[PDB]
Design a protein around this ligand. Sequence first.
Ligand SMILES: COc1ccc(Cc2nccc3cc(OC)c(OC)cc23)cc1OC
Ligand SMILES: COc1ccc(Cc2nccc3cc(OC)c(OC)cc23)cc1OC
Lengths: 145, 145
Amino acid sequence: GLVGKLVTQLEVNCDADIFYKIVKHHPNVIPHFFTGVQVTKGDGLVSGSIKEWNYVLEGKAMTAVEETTHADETRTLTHHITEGDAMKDYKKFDVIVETNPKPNGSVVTYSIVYEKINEDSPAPFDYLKFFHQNIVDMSAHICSS
Amino acid sequence: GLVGKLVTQLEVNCDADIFYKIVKHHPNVIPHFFTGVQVTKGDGLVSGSIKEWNYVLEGKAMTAVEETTHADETRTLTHHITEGDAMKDYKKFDVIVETNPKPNGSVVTYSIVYEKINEDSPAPFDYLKFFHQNIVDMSAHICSS
Ligand SMILES: COc1ccc(Cc2nccc3cc(OC)c(OC)cc23)cc1OC
Ligand SMILES: COc1ccc(Cc2nccc3cc(OC)c(OC)cc23)cc1OC
């Protein structure tokens, strides 16, 4: 089992497009900072970012290089990791965030698409829980009106 | 975030229908046993089961009552938990296993569909990892020919 995908999906009581705009532009207790740049398309408007993150996951300090892009039409954010501690375990590591209206608020889906270096590599449950708790935190700071 | 779904999806080098038949009818190192019954449809043939499991998850002994059904046409197995330790955290807890051919072997998807009792409940990452490791183990004991 070298290629796979982990997903956390959560219902949120918020219009999909509004929630997407919140996620696209947004905890201090988790140690983290980044340096990097913004990327533009051609009309001079920012379309994404390339960031080098320094962070602490489950007590351990790590770095990652991440390129973020977005698709407003499908309310999708994509984080493509090119370098860093996670690349000791994964040949490929991408995080896709989608927000959609409930067929019925919204459903938010975080998917971690991965390919392991070898069979001794773990699947990224640590990252799934980290992103899940981050999105639960953010969502509990949002309310109607 | 009270209603959600966790997923682990893995690629396997096996025909979908064959892999489904293997999963449908299949580690001793994990402490577990069950008692219970088989369920029939009307032609007298077994269509499912109702089992009371006794097991140890992350060192802790637990019980669960599980009703399993299957859909051969869609290669889907469904495990519906009605009682047990997990129901201290979840109002609803269902595990859905799907096997499909790669649009290209197969893709196996384990989904845990849950509703928490309250916001203090955890999301079932412990169960996701347990089912993931179980399916990785099983799949590493299967080879071509
Ligand atoms: C190795 O995997 C990653 C590691 C760090 C990041 C950085 C990152 N991207 C998006 C949202 C984030 C949100 C975070 O919490 C505020 C955070 O702290 C480490 C990092 C975040 C992304 C990663 O994949 C998207
Ligand atoms: C609380 O959640 C559950 C707890 C136990 C089970 C029992 C079960 N069902 C299917 C496959 C299993 C496979 C297991 O490993 C061999 C196992 O050991 C506890 C239990 C299994 C299912 C559960 O949900 C499907």
